[PDB]
C-alpha cells in the first residue's frame, strides 16, 4: 500500500493535531449550517478551504522528506 | 633572484593557460551550434529492409528528398550489364564499380540530364527511360542513349546486415 497513507495519518494525529482540530470544527459548523433551511438564500456561505490548506501545508512539512525516503 | 621573477610568471602563465583553455572550450562549444542539429542528423541515414523486395523488382525509397531506386537484380540482369565494353560509355564504369553487391543496384533515381525521374523497366537498354528528353539508362543504370551526360548517381550506402542497407 501507498506509504503516504500512513505517513499522512501519523502527521495529522501528531505534529499537526491543532490544525486537524480546526479543520474538524470547521467541517462540523459548515455541514450543520447547510442542514439548516434558507441556507441557499444566505449572503455568506462559509467553506473550510482555509483550514484545509493550513492542515495540508502542515502535513506536507512533516512528511515530504519521509515519503521520498521510502520510494 | 630568478626564483622571485619565476613565481610571478607562474601566476601570469597559469592565468594565461586557463584563459586559453577556457577560450578554446567556449569557442568550440559555441560554434558547434552551426554544425547539423539533431533533427537534421536524424533525417540522414535511411535504413531499408531487403527481405520484402522480390527478384526482378525495383523499389523507390525517399532519402534527402531525392528518390532512391533499389533493384533486386536477377542473375541474367547482372550478366546483361557486365557485357557492354566499358570503352563505349559516356560515363565509363562497370557494374562492379557501381554496386558493392551485384544483387543490389542502389541509385539516386533522378536523371543526370536535367532531373526528371526515369520510368523503370522501360528504355531501349531495358533499365530506365527518362521521358523528358529520352535518355536511356541500363540495368547498371548507366547512360547509353540520350542527352544525359552521366550514369545515375550512386548514394553512399552500406550493408549493415545482409537484409538491411543504410543509405
Amino acid at each position: 500500500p501507498d506509504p503516504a497513507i500512513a505517513l499522512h495519518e501519523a502527521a495529522a494525529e501528531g505534529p499537526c493535531h491543532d490544525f486537524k482540530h480546526h479543520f474538524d470544527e470547521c467541517v462540523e459548523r459548515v455541514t450543520k449550517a447547510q442542514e439548516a433551511e434558507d441556507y441557499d438564500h444566505a449572503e455568506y456561505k462559509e467553506d473550510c478551504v482555509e483550514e484545509f490548506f493550513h492542515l495540508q501545508h502542515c502535513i506536507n512539512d512533516n512528511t515530504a522528506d519521509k515519503l521520498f525516503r521510502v520510494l | 633572484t630568478d626564483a622571485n621573477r619565476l613565481f610571478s610568471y607562474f601566476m601570469i602563465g597559469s592565468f594565461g593557460m586557463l584563459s586559453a583553455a577556457g577560450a578554446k572550450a567556449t569557442v568550440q562549444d559555441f560554434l558547434s551550434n552551426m554544425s547539423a542539429s539533431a533533427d537534421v542528423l536524424a533525417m540522414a541515414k535511411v535504413e531499408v529492409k531487403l527481405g520484402a523486395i522480390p527478384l526482378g523488382k525495383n523499389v523507390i525509397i525517399k532519402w534527402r528528398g531525392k528518390p532512391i531506386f533499389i533493384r533486386h537484380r536477377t542473375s541474367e540482369e547482372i550478366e546483361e550489364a557486365n557485357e557492354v565494353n566499358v570503352a563505349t560509355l559516356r560515363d565509363p564504369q562497370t557494374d562492379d564499380e557501381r554496386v558493392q553487391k551485384p544483387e543490389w543496384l542502389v541509385m539516386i533515381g533522378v536523371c543526370t540530364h536535367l532531373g526528371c525521374v526515369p520510368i523503370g523497366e522501360a528504355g531501349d537498354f531495358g533499365g530506365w527511360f527518362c521521358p523528358c528528353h529520352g535518355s536511356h539508362y541500363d540495368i547498371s543504370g548507366r547512360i547509353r542513349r540520350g542527352p544525359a551526360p552521366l550514369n545515375l548517381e550512386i548514394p553512399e550506402y552500406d550493408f549493415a546486415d545482409a537484409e538491411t542497407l543504410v543509405i
Binding site: 455568506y44 462559509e46 482555509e50 | 622571485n4 621573477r5 610571478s8
Partner: protein, 85 residues
C-alpha cells in the same frame, strides 16, 4: 577640462617627491590579513547606518503591507476587505 600627457591641465606642481618600488620587489599581499579584518571593519562600521536605516525602514513598510494584504483576503478579513474596496 582634460588635456593629455605632458599638458594634463594640472596647476604647476613643485616640491612633491614621489617614491615607489617595483612590483617584483614588493609583497603584493603584505598586510592583507590586517586589511581584511581591521580595515574592512572600520570602513563598514562608518557606512553601516546609511544602509541599515533605509533598508530596515522599507522592509518594515513592506512587511506591514504584505501582512495586511494577506489578512484582508482571509475569512477573518472579509469585512475589512469589503470596506477597503
Amino acid at each position: 577640462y582634460m588635456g593629455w600627457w605632458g599638458h594634463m591641465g594640472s596647476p604647476p606642481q613643485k616640491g612633491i617627491a614621489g617614491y615607489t618600488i617595483s612590483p617584483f620587489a614588493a609583497r603584493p599581499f603584505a598586510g592583507v590579513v590586517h586589511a581584511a579584518i581591521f580595515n574592512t571593519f572600520r570602513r563598514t562600521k562608518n557606512q553601516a547606518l546609511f544602509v541599515i536605516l533605509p533598508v530596515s525602514f522599507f522592509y518594515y513598510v513592506w512587511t506591514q503591507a504584505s501582512e495586511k494584504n494577506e489578512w484582508l483576503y482571509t475569512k477573518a478579513g472579509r469585512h475589512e476587505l469589503a470596506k477597503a474596496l
